PDB file of C-alpha atoms and ligand atoms in Angstrom:
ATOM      1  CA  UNK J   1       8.104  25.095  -0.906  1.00  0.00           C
ATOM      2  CA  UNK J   2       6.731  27.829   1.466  1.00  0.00           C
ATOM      3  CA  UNK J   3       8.841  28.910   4.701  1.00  0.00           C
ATOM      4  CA  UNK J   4      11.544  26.263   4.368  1.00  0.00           C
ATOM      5  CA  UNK J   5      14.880  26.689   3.550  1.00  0.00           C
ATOM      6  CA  UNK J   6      17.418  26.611   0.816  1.00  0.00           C
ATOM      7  CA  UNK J   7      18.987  23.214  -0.114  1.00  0.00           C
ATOM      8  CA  UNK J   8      22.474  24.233  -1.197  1.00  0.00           C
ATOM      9  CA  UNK J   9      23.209  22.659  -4.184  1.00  0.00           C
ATOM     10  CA  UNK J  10      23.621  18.617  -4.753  1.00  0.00           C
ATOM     11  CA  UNK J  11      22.315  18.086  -0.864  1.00  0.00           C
ATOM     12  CA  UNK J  12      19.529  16.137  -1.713  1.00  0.00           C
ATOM     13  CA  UNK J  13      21.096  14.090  -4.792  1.00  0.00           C
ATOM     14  CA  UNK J  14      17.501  11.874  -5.766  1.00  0.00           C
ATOM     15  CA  UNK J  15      15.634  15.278  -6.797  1.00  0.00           C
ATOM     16  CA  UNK J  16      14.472  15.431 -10.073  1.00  0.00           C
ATOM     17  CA  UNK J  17      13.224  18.235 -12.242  1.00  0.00           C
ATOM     18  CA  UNK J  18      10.912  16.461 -14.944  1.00  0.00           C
ATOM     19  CA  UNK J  19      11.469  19.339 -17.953  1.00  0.00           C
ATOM     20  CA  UNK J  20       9.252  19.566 -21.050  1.00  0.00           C
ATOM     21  CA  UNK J  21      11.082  22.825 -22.381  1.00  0.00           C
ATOM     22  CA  UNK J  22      10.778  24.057 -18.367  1.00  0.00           C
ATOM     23  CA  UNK J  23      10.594  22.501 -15.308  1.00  0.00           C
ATOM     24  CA  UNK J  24       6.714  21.531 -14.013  1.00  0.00           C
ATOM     25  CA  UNK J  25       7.184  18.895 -11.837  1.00  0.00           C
ATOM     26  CA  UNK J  26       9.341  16.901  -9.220  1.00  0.00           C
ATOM     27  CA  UNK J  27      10.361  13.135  -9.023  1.00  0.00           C
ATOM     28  CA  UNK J  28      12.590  11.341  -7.282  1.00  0.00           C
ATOM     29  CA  UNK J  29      15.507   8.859  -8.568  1.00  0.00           C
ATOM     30  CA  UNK J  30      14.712   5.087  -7.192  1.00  0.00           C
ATOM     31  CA  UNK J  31      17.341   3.488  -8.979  1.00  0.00           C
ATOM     32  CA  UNK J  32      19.418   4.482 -12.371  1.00  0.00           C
ATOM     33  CA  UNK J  33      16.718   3.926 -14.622  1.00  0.00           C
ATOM     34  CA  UNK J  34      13.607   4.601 -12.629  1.00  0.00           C
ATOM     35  CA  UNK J  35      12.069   8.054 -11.802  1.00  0.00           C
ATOM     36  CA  UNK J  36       9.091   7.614  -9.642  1.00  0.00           C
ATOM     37  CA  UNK J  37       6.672  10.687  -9.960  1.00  0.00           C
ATOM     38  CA  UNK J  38       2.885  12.091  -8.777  1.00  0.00           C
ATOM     39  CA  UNK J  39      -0.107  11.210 -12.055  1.00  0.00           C
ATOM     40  CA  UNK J  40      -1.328  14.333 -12.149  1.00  0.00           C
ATOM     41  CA  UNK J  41       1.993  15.226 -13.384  1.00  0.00           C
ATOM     42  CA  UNK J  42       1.848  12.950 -16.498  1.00  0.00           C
ATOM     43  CA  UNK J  43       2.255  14.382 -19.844  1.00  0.00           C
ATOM     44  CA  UNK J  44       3.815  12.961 -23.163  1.00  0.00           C
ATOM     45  CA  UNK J  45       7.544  14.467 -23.892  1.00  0.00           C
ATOM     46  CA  UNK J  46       9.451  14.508 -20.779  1.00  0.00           C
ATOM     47  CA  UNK J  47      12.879  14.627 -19.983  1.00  0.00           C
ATOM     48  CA  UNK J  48      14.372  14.155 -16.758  1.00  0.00           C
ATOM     49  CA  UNK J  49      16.822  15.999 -15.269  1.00  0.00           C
ATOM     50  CA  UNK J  50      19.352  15.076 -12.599  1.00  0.00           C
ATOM     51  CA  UNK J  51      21.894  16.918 -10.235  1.00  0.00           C
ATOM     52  CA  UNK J  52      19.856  19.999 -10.396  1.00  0.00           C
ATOM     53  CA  UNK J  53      20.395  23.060  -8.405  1.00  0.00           C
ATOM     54  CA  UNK J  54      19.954  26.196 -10.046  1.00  0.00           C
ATOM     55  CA  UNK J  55      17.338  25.113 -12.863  1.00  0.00           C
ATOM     56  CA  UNK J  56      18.126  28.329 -15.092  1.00  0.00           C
ATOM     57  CA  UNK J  57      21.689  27.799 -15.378  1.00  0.00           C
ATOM     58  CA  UNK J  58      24.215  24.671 -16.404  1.00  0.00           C
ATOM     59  CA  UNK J  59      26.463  24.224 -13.318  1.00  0.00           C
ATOM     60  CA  UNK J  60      28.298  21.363 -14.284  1.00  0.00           C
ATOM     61  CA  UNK J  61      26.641  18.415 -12.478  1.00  0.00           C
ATOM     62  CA  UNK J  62      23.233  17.671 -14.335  1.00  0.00           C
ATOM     63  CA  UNK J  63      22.338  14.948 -16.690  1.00  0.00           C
ATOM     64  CA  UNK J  64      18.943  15.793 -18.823  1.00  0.00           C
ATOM     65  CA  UNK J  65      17.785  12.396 -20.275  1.00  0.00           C
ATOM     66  CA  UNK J  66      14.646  11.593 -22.172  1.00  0.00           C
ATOM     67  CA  UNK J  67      11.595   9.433 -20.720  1.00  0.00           C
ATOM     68  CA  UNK J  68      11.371   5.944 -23.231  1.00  0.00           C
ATOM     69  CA  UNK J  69       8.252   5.343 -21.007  1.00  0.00           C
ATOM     70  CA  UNK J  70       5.566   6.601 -18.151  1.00  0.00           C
ATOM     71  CA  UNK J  71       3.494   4.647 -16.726  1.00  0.00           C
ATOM     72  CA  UNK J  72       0.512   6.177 -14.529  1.00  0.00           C
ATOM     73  CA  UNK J  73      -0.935   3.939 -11.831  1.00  0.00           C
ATOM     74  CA  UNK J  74      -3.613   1.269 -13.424  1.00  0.00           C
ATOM     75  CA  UNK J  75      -5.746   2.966 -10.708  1.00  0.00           C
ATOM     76  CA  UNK J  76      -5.281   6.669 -10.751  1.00  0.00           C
ATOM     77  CA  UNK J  77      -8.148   8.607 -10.438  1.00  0.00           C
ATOM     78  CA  UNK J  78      -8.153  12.229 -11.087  1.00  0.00           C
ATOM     79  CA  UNK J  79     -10.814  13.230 -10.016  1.00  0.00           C
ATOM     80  CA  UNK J  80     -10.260  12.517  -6.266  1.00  0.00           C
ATOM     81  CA  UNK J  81      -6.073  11.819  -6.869  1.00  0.00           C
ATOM     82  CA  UNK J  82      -6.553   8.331  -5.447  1.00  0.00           C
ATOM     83  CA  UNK J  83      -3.067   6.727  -7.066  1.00  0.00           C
ATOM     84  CA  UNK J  84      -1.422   9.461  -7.542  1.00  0.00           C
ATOM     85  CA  UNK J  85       1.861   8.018  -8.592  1.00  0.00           C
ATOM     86  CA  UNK J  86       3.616   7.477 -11.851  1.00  0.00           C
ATOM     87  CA  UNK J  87       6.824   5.851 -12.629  1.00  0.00           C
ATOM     88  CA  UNK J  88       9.018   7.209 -15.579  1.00  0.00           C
ATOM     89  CA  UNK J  89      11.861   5.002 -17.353  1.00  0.00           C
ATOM     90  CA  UNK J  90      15.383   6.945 -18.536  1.00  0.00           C
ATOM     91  CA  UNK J  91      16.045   6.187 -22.148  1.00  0.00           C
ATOM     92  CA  UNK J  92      19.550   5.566 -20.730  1.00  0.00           C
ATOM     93  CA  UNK J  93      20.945   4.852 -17.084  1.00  0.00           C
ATOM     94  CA  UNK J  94      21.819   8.043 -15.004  1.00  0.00           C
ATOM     95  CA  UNK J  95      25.257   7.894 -13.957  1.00  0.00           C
ATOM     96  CA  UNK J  96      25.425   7.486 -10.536  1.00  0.00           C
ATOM     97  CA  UNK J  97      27.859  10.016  -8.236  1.00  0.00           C
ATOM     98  CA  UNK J  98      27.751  11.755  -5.114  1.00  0.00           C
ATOM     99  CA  UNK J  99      25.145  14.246  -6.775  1.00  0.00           C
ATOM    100  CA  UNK J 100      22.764  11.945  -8.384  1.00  0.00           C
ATOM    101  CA  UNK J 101      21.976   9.176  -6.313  1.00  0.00           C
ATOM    102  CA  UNK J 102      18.867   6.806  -5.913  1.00  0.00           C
ATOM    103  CA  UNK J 103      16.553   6.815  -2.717  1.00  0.00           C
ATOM    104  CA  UNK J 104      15.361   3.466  -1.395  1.00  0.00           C
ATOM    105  CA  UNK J 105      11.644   2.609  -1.211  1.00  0.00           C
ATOM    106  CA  UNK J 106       9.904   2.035   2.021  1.00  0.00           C
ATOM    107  CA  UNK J 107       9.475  -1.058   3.765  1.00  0.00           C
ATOM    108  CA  UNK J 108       6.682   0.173   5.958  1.00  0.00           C
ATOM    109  CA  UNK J 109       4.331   3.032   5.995  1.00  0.00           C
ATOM    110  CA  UNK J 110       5.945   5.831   8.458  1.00  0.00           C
ATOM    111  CA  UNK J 111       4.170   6.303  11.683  1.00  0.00           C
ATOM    112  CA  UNK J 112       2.276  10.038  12.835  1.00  0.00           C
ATOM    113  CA  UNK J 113       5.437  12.098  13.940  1.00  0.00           C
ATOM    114  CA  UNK J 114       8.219  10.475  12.065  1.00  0.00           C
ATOM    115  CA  UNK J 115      10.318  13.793  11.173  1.00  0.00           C
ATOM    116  CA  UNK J 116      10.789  13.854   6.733  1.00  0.00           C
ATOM    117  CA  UNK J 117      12.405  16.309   4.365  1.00  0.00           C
ATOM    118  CA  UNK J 118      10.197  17.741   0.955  1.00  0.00           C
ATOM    119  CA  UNK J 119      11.825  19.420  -1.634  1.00  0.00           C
ATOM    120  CA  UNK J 120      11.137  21.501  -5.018  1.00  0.00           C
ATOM    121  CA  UNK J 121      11.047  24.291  -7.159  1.00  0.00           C
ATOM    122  CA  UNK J 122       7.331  25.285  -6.225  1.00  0.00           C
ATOM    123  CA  UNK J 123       5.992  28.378  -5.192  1.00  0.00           C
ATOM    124  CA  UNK J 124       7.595  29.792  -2.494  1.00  0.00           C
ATOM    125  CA  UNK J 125       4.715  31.785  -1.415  1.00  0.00           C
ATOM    126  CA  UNK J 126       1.358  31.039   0.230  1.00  0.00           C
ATOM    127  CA  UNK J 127      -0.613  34.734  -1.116  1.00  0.00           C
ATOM    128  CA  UNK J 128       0.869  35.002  -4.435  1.00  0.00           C
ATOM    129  CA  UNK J 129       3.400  33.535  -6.915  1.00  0.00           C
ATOM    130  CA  UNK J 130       6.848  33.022  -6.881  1.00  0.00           C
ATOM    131  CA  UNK J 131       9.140  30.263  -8.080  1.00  0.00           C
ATOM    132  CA  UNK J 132      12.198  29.920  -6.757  1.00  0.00           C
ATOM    133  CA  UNK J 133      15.792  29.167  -9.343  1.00  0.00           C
ATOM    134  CA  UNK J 134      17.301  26.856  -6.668  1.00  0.00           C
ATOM    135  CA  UNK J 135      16.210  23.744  -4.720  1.00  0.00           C
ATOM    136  CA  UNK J 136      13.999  24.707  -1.497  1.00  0.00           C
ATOM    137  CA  UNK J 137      13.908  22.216   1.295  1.00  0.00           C
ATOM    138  CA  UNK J 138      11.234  21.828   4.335  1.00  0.00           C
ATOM    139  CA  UNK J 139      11.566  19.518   7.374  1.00  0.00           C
ATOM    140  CA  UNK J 140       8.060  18.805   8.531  1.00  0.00           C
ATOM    141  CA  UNK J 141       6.456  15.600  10.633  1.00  0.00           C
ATOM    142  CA  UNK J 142       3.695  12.893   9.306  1.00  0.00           C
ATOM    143  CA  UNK J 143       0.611  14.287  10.455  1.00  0.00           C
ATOM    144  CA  UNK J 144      -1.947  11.224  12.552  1.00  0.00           C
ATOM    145  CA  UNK J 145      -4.469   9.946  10.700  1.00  0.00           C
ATOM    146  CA  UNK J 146      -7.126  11.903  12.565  1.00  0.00           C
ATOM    147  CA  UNK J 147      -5.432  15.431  12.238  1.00  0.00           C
ATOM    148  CA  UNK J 148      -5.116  14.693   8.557  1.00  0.00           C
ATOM    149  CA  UNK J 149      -8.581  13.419   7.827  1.00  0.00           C
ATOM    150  CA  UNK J 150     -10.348  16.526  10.256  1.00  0.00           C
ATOM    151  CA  UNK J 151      -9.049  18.921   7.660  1.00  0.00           C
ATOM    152  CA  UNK J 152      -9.834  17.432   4.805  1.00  0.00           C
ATOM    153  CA  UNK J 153     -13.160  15.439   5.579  1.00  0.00           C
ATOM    154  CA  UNK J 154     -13.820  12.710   2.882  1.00  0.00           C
ATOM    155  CA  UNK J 155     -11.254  13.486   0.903  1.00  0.00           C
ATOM    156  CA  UNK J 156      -8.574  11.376   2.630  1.00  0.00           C
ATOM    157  CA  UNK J 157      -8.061   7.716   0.941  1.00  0.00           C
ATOM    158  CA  UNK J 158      -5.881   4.971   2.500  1.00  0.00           C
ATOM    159  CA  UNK J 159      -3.518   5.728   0.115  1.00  0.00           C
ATOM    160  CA  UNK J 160      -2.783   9.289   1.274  1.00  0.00           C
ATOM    161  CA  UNK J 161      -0.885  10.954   4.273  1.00  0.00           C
ATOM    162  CA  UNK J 162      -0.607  14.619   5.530  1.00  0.00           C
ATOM    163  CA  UNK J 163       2.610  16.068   6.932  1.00  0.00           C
ATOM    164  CA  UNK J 164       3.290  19.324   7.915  1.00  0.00           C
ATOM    165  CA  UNK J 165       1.899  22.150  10.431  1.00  0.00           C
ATOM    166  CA  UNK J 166      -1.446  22.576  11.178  1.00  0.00           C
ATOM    167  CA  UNK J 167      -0.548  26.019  12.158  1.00  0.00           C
ATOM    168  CA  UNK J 168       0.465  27.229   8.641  1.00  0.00           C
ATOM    169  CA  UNK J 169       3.144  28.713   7.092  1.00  0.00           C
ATOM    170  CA  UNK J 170       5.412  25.670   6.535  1.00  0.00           C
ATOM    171  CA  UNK J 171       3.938  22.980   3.433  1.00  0.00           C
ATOM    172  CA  UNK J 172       4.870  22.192  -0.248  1.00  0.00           C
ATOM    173  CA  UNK J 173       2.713  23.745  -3.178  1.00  0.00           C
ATOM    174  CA  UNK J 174       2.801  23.825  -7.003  1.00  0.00           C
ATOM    175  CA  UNK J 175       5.936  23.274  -9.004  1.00  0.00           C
ATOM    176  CA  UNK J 176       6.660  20.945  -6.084  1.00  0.00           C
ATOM    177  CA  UNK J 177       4.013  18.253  -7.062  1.00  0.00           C
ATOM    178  CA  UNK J 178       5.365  14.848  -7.898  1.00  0.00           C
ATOM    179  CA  UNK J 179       8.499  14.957  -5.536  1.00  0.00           C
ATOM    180  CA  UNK J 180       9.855  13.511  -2.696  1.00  0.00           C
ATOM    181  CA  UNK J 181       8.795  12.969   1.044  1.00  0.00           C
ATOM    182  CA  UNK J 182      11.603  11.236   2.166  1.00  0.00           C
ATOM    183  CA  UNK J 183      11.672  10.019   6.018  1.00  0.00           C
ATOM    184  CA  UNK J 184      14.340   8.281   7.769  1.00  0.00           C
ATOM    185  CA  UNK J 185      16.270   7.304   4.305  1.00  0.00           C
ATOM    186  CA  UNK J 186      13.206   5.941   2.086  1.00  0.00           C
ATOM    187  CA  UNK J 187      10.968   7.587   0.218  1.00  0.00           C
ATOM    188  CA  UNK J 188       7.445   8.007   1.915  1.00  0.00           C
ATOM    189  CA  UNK J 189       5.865  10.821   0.468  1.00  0.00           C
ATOM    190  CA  UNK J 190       5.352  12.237  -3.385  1.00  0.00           C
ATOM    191  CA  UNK J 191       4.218  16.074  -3.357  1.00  0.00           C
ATOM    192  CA  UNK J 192       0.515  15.194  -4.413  1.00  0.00           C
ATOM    193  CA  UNK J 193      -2.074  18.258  -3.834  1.00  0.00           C
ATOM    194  CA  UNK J 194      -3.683  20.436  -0.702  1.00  0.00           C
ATOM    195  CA  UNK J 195      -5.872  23.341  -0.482  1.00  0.00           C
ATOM    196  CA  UNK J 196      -3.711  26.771  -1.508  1.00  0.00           C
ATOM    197  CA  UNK J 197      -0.548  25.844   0.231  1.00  0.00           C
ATOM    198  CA  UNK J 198       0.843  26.713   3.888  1.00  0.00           C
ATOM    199  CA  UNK J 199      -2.432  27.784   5.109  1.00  0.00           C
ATOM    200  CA  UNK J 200      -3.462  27.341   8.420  1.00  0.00           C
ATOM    201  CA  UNK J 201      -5.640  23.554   9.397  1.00  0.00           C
ATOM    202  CA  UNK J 202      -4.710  22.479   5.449  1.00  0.00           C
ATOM    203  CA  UNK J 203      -1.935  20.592   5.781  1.00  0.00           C
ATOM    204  CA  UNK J 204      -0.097  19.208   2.267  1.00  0.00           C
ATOM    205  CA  UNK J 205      -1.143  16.128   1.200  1.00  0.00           C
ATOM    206  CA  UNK J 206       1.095  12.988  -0.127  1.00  0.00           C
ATOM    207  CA  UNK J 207       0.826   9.736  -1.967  1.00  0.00           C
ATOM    208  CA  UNK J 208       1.361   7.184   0.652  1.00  0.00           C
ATOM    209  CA  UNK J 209       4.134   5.365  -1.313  1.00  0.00           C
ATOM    210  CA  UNK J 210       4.677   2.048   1.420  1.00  0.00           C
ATOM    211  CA  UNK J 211       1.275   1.089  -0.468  1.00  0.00           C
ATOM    212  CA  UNK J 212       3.008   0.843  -3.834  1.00  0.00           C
ATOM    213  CA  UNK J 213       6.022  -0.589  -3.269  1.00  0.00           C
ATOM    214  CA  UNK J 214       4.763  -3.743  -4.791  1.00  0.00           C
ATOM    215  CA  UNK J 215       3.660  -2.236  -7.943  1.00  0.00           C
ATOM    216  CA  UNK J 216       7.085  -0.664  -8.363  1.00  0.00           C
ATOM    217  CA  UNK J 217       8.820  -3.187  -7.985  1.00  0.00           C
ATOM    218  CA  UNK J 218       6.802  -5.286 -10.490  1.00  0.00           C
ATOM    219  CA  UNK J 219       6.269  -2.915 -12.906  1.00  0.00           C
ATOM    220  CA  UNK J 220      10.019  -2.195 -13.093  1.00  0.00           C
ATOM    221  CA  UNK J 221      11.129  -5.233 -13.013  1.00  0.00           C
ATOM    222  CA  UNK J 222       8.871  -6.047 -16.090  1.00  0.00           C
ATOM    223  CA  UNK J 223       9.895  -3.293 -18.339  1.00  0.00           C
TER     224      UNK J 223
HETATM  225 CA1   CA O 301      21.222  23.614 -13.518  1.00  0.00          CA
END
């Protein structure tokens, strides 16, 4: 996350670090079993771990817990990061507390303006490299249609939104990728790529996640 904010610790209870011997991607907690996730964050060997704050250090809250399953999107494409979404089954139920809780699912895809929070472990900066211990946190607005697809001609699907500032400064960037855009209590958003990050007319990119709802609920409820 560059130019937002620190979190404080447990504030934003369905964050996820997705850990294969170090943290590489966010996710978000949709119910106790179910970690939903960007594609291009898929790899074999993950375990997921919730009530994270610091990430380097055991503060008492966290529960790390092995994927039994992924499952990328039948229709990811990596190429252009169509689909990028992936859902990840716990080997065993999170418990549930005031510091690892689930975040509902949209029931409708947010409209331009509607005000959402982002959060992760990415790079903090937008010239160099720097990844932050703690959980960094950005409030930033859904972007219109037209702003969104002006900076990124062609490369906008239907299944995509911007949000952010066209002025720079203020966006999500790597280490954040697969986390949560969440916007009026539902999760809208998944960290999903841009070009560099917080620079000026490139607003970050997200998977538009009101256009999956059916999938996730299927696929869940089938495995
Ligand atoms: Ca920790």
């Amino acid at each position: 996350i560059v130019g937002g904010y620190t979190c404080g610790a447990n504030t934003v209870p369905y964050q996820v670090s997705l850990n294969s011997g170090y943290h590489f991607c966010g996710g978000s907690l949709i119910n106790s079993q179910w970690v939903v996730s960007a594609a291009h964050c898929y790899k074999s060997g993950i375990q997921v771990r919730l009530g994270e704050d610091n990430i380097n250090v055991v503060e008492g809250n966290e529960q790390f817990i092995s994927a039994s399953k992924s499952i990328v999107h039948p229709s990811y494409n990596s190429n252009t990061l169509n689909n990028d979404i992936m859902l990840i089954k716990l080997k065993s139920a999170a418990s549930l507390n005031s510091r690892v809780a689930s975040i509902s699912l949209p029931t409708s895809c947010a409209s331009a303006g509607t005000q959402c929070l982002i959060s992760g472990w990415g790079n903090t900066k937008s010239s160099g490299t720097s990844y932050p211990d703690v959980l960094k946190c950005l409030k930033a607005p859904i972007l219109s249609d037209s702003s969104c697809k002006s900076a990124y001609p062609g490369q906008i699907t239907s299944n995509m939104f911007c949000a952010g500032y066209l002025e720079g400064g203020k966006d999500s960037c790597q280490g954040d990728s697969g986390g949560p855009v969440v916007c009026s209590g539902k999760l809208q958003g998944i960290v999903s790529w841009g070009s560099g990050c917080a620079q000026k007319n490139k607003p970050g990119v997200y998977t538009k996640v009101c256009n999956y709802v059916s999938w996730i609920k299927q696929t869940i409820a089938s495995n």
